[PDB]
Amino acid sequence: MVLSEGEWQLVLHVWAKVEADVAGHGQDILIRLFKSHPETLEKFDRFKHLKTEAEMKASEDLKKHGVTVLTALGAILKKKGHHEAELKPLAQSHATKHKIPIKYLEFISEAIIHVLHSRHPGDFGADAQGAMNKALELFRKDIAAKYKELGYQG
Ligand code: HEM
């Protein structure tokens, strides 16, 4: 809800390792999301036809969308909570057009933490994880509040 400066530094330090391979991370993240919560796949008319993990990894458009996710997320994270203006378009499209429940944001948050562990086994320790979890939570809580402001959910 409020991150210390240290936690924000941890988040941005970790995020710089995402930005080193945005496509790899975004692809993995979407794949983990889709494998651990298949219900989220059917939200994607572009991808709902992808079943095996090998198929999803061969989907360039899935990779492209991973980039879109993470670049949008990274722009938000870099604001260190001052992401009001960056969230509204995301909240708007995910509440009203995509109809994404906040719970689905929790699933992708888990998929982010998981993927960061499997791509950075020595770089993503307990502190960095706590910091990243708090950042994604704040993100999810603020998105929740922006849903409510658009008159949606919860
Ligand atoms: C960190 C969390 C997330 C971020 C930053 C994010 C970001 C974005 C962005 C930038 C777009 C493109 C512009 C737009 O449509 O608003 C998009 C589209 C979309 N998002 Fe998300 N998203 C997140 C979580 C999710 C989750 C968890 C789901 C569903 C389970 C989802 C479903 C969709 C869908 C269906 C689209 C349209 C896809 C398409 O047009 O092919 N999003 N998202």
In order of their start, the domains of the chain are 1-154 (1.10.490.10)
Residue whose pair of structure tokens reads 């969230």 in the numeric block: 87
Q: Where are the beta strands (DSSP E) in the chain?
A: none
d(CA 144, CA 150): 10
Resolution to 1 decimal place, in Å: 2.0
Count CB neighbours of 84 within 10 A: 11
Residue whose pair of structure tokens reads 């993100």 in the numeric block: 139
Q: Which atom of ligand 1 is nearest to the CA of 136?
A: 1
Task: Give Cβ neighbours of residue 90 (< 8 Å, ≥ 6 apart).
Answer: 72, 76, 143
Gap from CA of 69 to ligand 1 centroid (Å): 6
Q: List the structure tokens of 55.
A: 């198929």
Distances (CA, A) of 117 to 38, 71, 98, 102, 113: 21, 19, 28, 23, 6
d(CA 73, CA 152): 21
Gap from CA of 40 to ligand 1 centroid (Å): 11
d(CA 89, CA 42): 22
d(CA 106, CA 139): 10
Q: Which atom of ligand 1 is nearest to the CA of 46?
A: 41
Residue 17, phi then psi, degrees to nearest 5: -80, -25
Q: What is the DSSP string of 21-47?
A: GHHHHHHHHHHHHHHH-GGGGGG-TTT
Which residue, judged by its Cα, is nearest atom 33 of ligand 1?
98
Distances (CA, A) of 44 to 34, 81, 122: 10, 28, 33
d(CA 55, CA 147): 33
Q: What is the Cβ-side half-sphere exposure of residue 23, based on CA atoms within 13 angstroms?
A: 8
DSSP state, 81? Answer: T
The backbone region for 109, taken as left when phi is positive above 0, alpha when psi lies in -120 to 50, beta otherwise, is alpha
Long-range CB pairs of 142-145, under 8 A, 24+ apart, other chains included = 142/83, 142/84, 142/87, 143/87, 143/90, 143/91, 143/94, 143/102, 143/105, 144/102
Which residue, judged by its Cα, is nearest atom 31 of ligand 1?
100
Give the residue, out of 18, 94, 114, 142, with the most ligand 1 atoms within 8 A of its beta carbon, to mutate for a pocket test: 94
Residue whose pair of structure tokens reads 């036809």 in the numeric block: 49
